[PDB]
Amino acid sequence: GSHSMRYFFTSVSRPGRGEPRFIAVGYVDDTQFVRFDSDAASQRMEPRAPWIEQEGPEYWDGETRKVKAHSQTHRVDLGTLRGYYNQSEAGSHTVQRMYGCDVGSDWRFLRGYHQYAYDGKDYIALKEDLRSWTAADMAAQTTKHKWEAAHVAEQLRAYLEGTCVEWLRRYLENGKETLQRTDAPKTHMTHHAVSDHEATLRCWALSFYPAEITLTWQRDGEDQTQDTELVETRPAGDGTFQKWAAVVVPSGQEQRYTCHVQHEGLPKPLTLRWEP
């Protein structure tokens, strides 16, 4: 399958006292492997997957230095943007940044990205071609002119097409026993009477990885969305994911309904039907 390496950064200003809160997390696919939190005691990038622990001190020192440099950039940006938007010094603001790279099933570079938001709104982002920027407003346009003159896109493109995928490949090999295996959903259907005349069927998908999944209900082999409920895919806390979907049906007609489960770990989709 295809794979991704992504880094997510959040900085939130603290007008009352001190410097911004800064939180950085790194993922391979849906697996968190590192974190940095400015409030944590270590002041180091920290491992969050066993496979990254085999990297040596020079890796950890370099990642700590770089992550701190990201924190400082975000601090400066919170000040600059407060000025660009004519905002008071009294309020707390937020910057969010995400970037990363994907490789295809062929293990070659597939795409890169780099996106930045201010106060939860798009600010500036690299276009798919990795050569130009999308600026949402005149403040971001000013940033775009700066970055164009500094050849920021050229340097990022070199990282995204080169370094980023080389390291993603390295992590994929070192973490292979988890990162290159799929956990197919463990599925189950429950039944509840909700009145004298209706029942709710709930289709469960448990313990799956990666998080992407499709759960759909069919009545007599046609997709049904009315009278259904879906929850957001949620983390189990052990590295896997959970989801369910439910449908209300006339009592006695349960057998007309099937729940269809599609996942990377399932070579053919699963179909569940209430009979017993």
Binding site: E63, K66, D77, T80, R97, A150, T163
Partner: peptide
Amino acid sequence: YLEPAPVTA
């Protein structure tokens, strides 16, 4: 592996 030099906005 992080990118080394985030430029200010």
